């Protein structure tokens, strides 16, 4: 995803990635990781994939 | 800080979802999934810099 949208990615939010495309349940157990990839996932002129 | 009042209005706010990225989101005294199945009483927007 994009930066912004990491916090999207947990219990309870909403925004785009929480309602349309990724959502995890109220009663989760378990846990995510994030970090950033500019240096692998970004290429000049923009990764459309 | 600039306040606004709002009134006569529908919270859609998934048009937000189309062009605006926000940094931070985070809302006391509401659960943000229970958003859309709410009604608002006296809304102000405090906006600033
Ligand atoms: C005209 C200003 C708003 C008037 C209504 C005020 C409060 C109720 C609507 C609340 C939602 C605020 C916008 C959140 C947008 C989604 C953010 C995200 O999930 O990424």
């Given at each position: 995803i994009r930066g912004d949208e990491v916090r999207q990615i947990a219990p309870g939010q909403t925004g785009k990635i929480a309602d349309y495309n990724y959502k995890l349940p109220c009663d989760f157990t378990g846990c995510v990781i994030a970090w950033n990839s500019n240096n692998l996932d970004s290429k000049v002129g923009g990764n459309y994939n | 800080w600039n306040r606004k009042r709002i009134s006569?209005?529908?919270?859609?706010?998934?048009?937000?979802?189309?062009?605006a990225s926000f940094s931070t989101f985070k809302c006391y005294?509401?659960?943000?999934?229970?958003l859309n199945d709410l009604c608002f009483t006296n809304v102000y927007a405090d906006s600033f810099v």
């Open positions: - | 006569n209005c529908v919270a859609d706010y998934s048009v937000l979802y189309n062009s005294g509401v659960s943000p999934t229970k």
